[PDB]
Design a protein around this ligand. Sequence first.
Ligand SMILES: [Mg+2]
Ligand SMILES: [Mg+2]
Ligand SMILES: [Mg+2]
Ligand SMILES: [Mg+2]
Lengths: 388, 380
Amino acid sequence: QSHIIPTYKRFDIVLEKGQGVYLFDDKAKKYLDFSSGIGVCALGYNHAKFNAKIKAQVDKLLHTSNLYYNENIAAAAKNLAKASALERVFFTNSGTESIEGAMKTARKYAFNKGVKGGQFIAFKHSFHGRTLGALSLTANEKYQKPFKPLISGVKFAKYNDISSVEKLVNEKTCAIILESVQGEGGINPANKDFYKALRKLCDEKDILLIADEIQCGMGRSGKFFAYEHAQILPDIMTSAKALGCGLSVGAFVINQKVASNSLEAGDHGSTYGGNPLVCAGVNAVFEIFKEEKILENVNKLTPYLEQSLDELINEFDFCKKRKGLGFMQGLSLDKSVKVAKVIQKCQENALLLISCGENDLRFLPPLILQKEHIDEMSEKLRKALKSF
Amino acid sequence: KRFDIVLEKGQGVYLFDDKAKKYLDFSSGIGVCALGYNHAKFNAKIKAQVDKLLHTSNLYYNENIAAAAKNLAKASALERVFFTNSGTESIEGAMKTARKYAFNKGVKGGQFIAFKHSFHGRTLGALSLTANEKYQKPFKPLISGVKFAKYNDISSVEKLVNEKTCAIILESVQGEGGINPANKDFYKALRKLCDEKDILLIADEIQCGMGRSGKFFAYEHAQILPDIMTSAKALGCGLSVGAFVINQKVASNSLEAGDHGSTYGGNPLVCAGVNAVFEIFKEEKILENVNKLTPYLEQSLDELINEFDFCKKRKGLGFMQGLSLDKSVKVAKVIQKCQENALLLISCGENDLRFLPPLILQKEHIDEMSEKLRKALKSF
Ligand SMILES: [Mg+2]
Ligand SMILES: [Mg+2]
Ligand SMILES: [Mg+2]
Ligand SMILES: [Mg+2]
């Protein structure tokens, strides 16, 4: 996961095309996609409105470089600033690049207050990216070992445990960074009380709160960003994946406090990064989310999704606990059943799921999902589970 | 920095601003848009893939990605391709691969030798390979284990080598830090040295690669092959994509890398783009065009050095050229005057004009650049 992925970790399936919530392999087999390409394809596949906006921009301009302005980029930044409720957007090409941008920003914020070598508190069981800065933010020595030494100055607390955070704070701490919903060690949403405690701690100590919304952001929680459920605002947030619904784009957004103390004289005061194509995509995502009432759809269907998963937990002893937020759900399985084998049976049954944690199923359906697809998922997954 | 120009669209080698003013583009979006703008065949190939699938994740296979890797492996002359989203991500991947290579040989915490005036990217790993302390200062500490040699000076490299050195990385033509091509003999000496010490030679071809030098990759001019190379920018001709490519030696010393079914990144859309770039390059004989026109391009820049006292030196390779200006004339103002004259140039180095025209350039366009640049130079 930290570097190059070997054959045994990938699926023996060649995908060719998609339509709505379905993906088709090279044998024309139709699968219900309940993974969204790992939380990326919020609008499913070949969404007519999305594809039209992308194609129109292809015929206009793909790339300008940061040396010039483009209206698409300004409009996309405005959209994301409004949705995140932060102030200044910096577009990147990926989630991991956004994480790097956030780290640099937090380091510079500290440096400008005369704190050199700002340190980071992150959380065990999280993963933030494969580039060397982001990789320094994972506690698992396994993901790091051959690449050390990495970025020093990172310490690891326990997710949802405020006392473990307080214990590690000092005069040199520049940021606390958390995924709003963990995945690496299993799906695990940040508690509302924990997000509030962190916001208060960060206020009191002038430490930057960094919300990593790459996996859970852009509508999947039923709000644009999962931290909204806790009614706090971070000082910096990162977003990617569904931000571009399939196009390569990422961003780190910072509030006015950070902006006023980290950007130097020479700042043009405008958006940084991005290109006209992917930003046309970002604008499309926001416009379509609004028109098709996608947040409303997630909120409407989340109770049914959770109910359906809980029914499977009731029916099968080896299905243990469900955790999740909106359309980001996880189900832990007993060691008596291998998750990879459950996933194989599902694929045979024309259902695409993925895993996380020790032995857990992960559910990340497209946000355009209908109730009928939840029933289809339940039917196919039930058939798989019955064989164990 | 940012110019006060809003770009809206382009056609061929021309870009248009939001007032419909037409500019000759001699920068290619900083070396990215090799096929210029709105190439009809390129765009048709992209839109075709938009209608199929944009994204799979690395858990599944896709024919476009396999074909793109095959194309890049062949053009590079290296064994395995790992796609990323950007140049800086490719550098990070190359660094990790180099460290892991040494790690498996029993050498922990492999060190890197980079070169002064280099630029490799903005992410924390790539930034560690950047020479100037002013890019790094507030972000420190960065990745430990980087030392900096003098470019084209094999002696300075030898002095920095030790038991922990796992890689020597260079741009085949230094760009952002001032246009400066690696000398043939220096590249051969690096290859020889890396061979003898089992140190990985990493060629950063992000700026100078994908045909700009007249060959697919600039290191081909030295008739050497690196152990790892990085590509981006023109690799996608406007689409966001990067790659780090490794040879058999590196692949076979990594369980994951040597595995034929292995992957890093990439997606069907950008990889369809990569395949279109290779098909078009071949079909339209892009490399031949660069070789045909480079002499005339260089001649035209040379004619400006003779003409204007403050135009000092020209250095370059193929369609990557730089022209240094005396301290007496600020390059930023020359660039502004060129924009008035409807020509888009950029800068590099201490006070230098950087020329990165689209590879679809025609002789006529060089004459246009000359007349507009001369007009600007005459005003100083
Ligand atoms: Mg409690
Ligand atoms: Mg709590
Ligand atoms: Mg049960
Ligand atoms: Mg419904």
